[model samples]
Target chain A: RETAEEVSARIVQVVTAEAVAVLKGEQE
Target chain B: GAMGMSHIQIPPGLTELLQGYTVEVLRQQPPDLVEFAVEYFTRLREARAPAS
Candidate 1:
């Protein structure tokens, strides 16, 4: 799919969000 | 997978974004082959996560 933002921005947003979730739950 | 967790409670945008990726991959690949793509993304997300 295509995002309005750059692919890098979308990838970063996605990966960063995933990291936050992992931080919320230990050893997730 | 809480599927469409974005509509639920938690910060589901991550999964939502990934879900969009999944659907996109599915459209490009065959049904039986979808699992490979899904698992690949799942593992990639897990690898990049913090507590993992």
Candidate 2:
């Protein structure tokens, strides 16, 4: 298990990645 | 070399909380990334703070 900070950090990364993909018009 | 922490715990609703924000970002397609992040968290806090 990871800390809330770790989970939040990773989710932020995931969200940012998805945001970039969406901006690039190539997301799921 | 670096060492890692052990016996960690994840806060509940962390994924859902961020996922909803991310989904809205996609649906809204906001042009400003930084501003959108700010708004999302701000609204989230206010929503639960009972201080509209």
Candidate 3:
């Protein structure tokens, strides 16, 4: 497993979107 | 002891970042997300290293 801007950026994107769901009370 | 939010000192912006990933894990409800996230954090933290 390597780390770079591209990978981190994708994580940021996915997590940010999911966080909205988390905040929205959809995740269990 | 089972899993629970016992005590976690969250870094700046780390809470939200982890929150995002946690949501995905729960959304997917996969059993291996624990291992996946561990590796993910490990690599992501290393990415911030100062290469001299």
Candidate 4:
């Protein structure tokens, strides 16, 4: 199993990407 | 050679919202992401359990 640190890191990356996508009006 | 992270563009208003809690969650250590979300939702559900 991955460490909490690793999981949290991935969550940050994914959430950031999603946020950016929404901001760009690229995705809703 | 250096590795690069991909970047996405966000709207100003949404970006403002993302800035705070998103950064806080990202920076949080153990208890991690999934646990944090699960715990939050669980608490919400439990809070309403008395009525249900």
lDDT of 4 at A16: 66
Model 2 RMSD vs true structure: 6.0
| TM-score for the B chain of model 4 | 0.35
Q: Summarize candidate 3's per-residue lDDT along B1-52 as a digit string, tens digits.
A: 1135343233346646666677656555456767777777687788866667
Which consecutive 10 residues in model 4 chain B have the weakest lDDT in total?
B1-10
> What is the per-residue lDDT of model 1 for residues B1-52, given as tens digits with 9 covering 90 to 100?
8664433234545555555655555456636656766664775476568574
Give the TM-score of chain A, superposed on the true chain A, for all candidates in the order listed.
Answer: 0.46, 0.57, 0.46, 0.55
Which runs in model 2 stand beyond 4 Å of their true positions? B1-11, B25-52
Worst 10 residues of 2 chain B by lDDT: B1-10
Over the stretch A1-28, how does candidate 3's per-residue lDDT look in tens digits?
Answer: 3334444555555565766666677678
The prediction achieving the highest lDDT against the true structure is: 2
Looking at the true structure's interface, with contacts defined as alpha carbon pairs within 8 Å between chains A and B, what fraction does model 3 recover? Answer: 0.10
lDDT of each: 0.56, 0.67, 0.59, 0.52
Give the DockQ-based CAPRI class for model 4. incorrect
RMSD of each: 12.1, 6.0, 12.8, 12.2
What TM-score would every model get versus the actual structure? 0.30, 0.45, 0.37, 0.33
By TM-score, the candidates rank as 2, 3, 4, 1
Interface RMSD score of each model: 8.5, 5.0, 10.0, 10.9
Cα lDDT tens digits, model 1, A1-28, are: 7753345346656666665566555345
- Across all candidates, what is each one's fraction of true contacts kept? 0.00, 0.59, 0.10, 0.10
